[PDB]
């Protein structure tokens, strides 16, 4: 439970068009959690210093999902819908470097820490965060601001260290009315490890054993299907170095000549989509990223979710 938020912030219903749907070399679907943990850090270096606050955690709640896919004739797999790119200066068609896209309706429980809570009102913070977050892009996709027939959904804020124990189930059961048509994505790292010593029949690794939880696999009649622990998905769970760290000028194709570089690989894990009524406290639902730069581990998870 590192850096417990003194305030939760609910960016209520963000509508996103053309988000990246590939998300890893192995997975596809809902985009990576590192996109969200980078989005909250891009908020943090635009309004977080001007308000002296700290946006550090993020809760991912997907309300609506739609992918540009199509199922071919005579196959049970999917293929991705594409865009026609511009031509070359030769007049010929360029290569088809395929990309997956998805529409996306999301909610973001942010978590605020600093001393700027105690200087500004709770309504000043929420507008300066919301109207900033309509200038940015989430997963390569445009955050589309509100216009409709209904009313724009407002950006609330709790102060979850404030109140009695009756307010600690009056407040955290008031936001859950605004998160309930969708599902929350949490990190399940203990399941994939306790399913690894569960396999005593074979002695596998975590690669073939995360592939054995994605399955609606069918067991022989002693037919039947093996039991469901929930709605489990594979997620990208960070990065891992495959190179030593380079000095910040000794590659001349970097994004900048002031930051060190590593060549990294992906690092795959397990997650679960669950209704937010199973959630005891909504601060346990937040995504952080910790790094071990002495190792090569750059990863993200939801800690404090038992």
């Amino acid at each position: 439970s590192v850096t417990d938020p003194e305030a939760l912030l609910l960016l209520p219903r963000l509508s996103i068009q053309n988000a990246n749907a590939i998300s890893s070399p192995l997975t596809w679907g809902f985009p990576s959690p590192g996109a969200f943990t980078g989005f909250v850090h891009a908020l943090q270096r635009r309004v977080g210093i001007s308000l002296d606050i700290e946006l550090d955690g993020v809760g991912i709640v997907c309300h609506r999902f739609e992918a540009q896919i199509s199922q071919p004739a005579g196959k049970r797999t999917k293929v991705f819908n594409l865009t026609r790119n511009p031509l070359n200066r030769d007049g010929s068609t360029a290569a088809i470097v395929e990309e997956g896209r998805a529409h996306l309706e999301v909610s973001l429980l942010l978590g605020v820490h600093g001393d700027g809570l105690d200087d500004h009102p709770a309504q000043e913070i929420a507008r300066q965060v919301q109207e900033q977050a309509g200038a940015m892009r989430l997963a390569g996709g445009s955050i589309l601001p509100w216009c409709n027939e209904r009313f724009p959904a407002p950006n609330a804020e709790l102060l979850m260290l404030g109140g009695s124990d009756e307010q600690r189930r009056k407040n955290q059961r008031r936001l859950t009315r605004r998160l309930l048509p969708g599902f929350a994505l949490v990190s399940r790292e203990a399941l994939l490890q306790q399913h690894l010593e569960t396999l005593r029949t074979t002695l596998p690794e975590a690669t073939t054993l995360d592939a054995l939880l994605d399955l609606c696999r069918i067991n022989f009649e002693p037919w039947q299907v093996r039991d469901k622990p929930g709605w489990l998905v594979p997620i990208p769970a960070g990065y891992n170095a495959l190179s030593p760290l380079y000095l910040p000028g000794e590659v001349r194709n970097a994004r900048d000549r002031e930051t060190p570089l590593r060549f990294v690989e992906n690092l795959f894990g397990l997650g679960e989509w669950l209704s937010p009524h199973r959630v005891a406290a909504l601060s346990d639902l937040l995504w952080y990223h910790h790094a071990e730069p002495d190792k090569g581990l750059y990863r993200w998870s939801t800690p404090r979710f038992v």
């Binding site: 059961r173 309930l180 048509p181 009524h277």
Partner: protein, 108 residues
Amino acid sequence: AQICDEALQYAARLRELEPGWSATPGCQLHDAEQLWLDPLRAQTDETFLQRRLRGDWPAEVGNRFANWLNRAVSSDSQILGSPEAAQWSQELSKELTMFKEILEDERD
């Protein structure tokens, strides 16, 4: 508990997305759902009660699908006269604990 959650999911889907009601035809066994599938509509949808500002005793839904779950199966016979039939009434004493106040807090 998954069914108790996806019932609330169904309630939340029908809560939004439906900007009209014409409930006069077609219904002859489906009643007492103004606390369960009805928005506020900025209008007194009362039924000669205090429905619009008060929403208590929600056994018109809670027990009414707690019996729906029991009548999902009737061929189970030898559970009667056993100490394991008490275990089946444990989690239905649990979903009759956690379901009330999340149905009163929407009408205020």
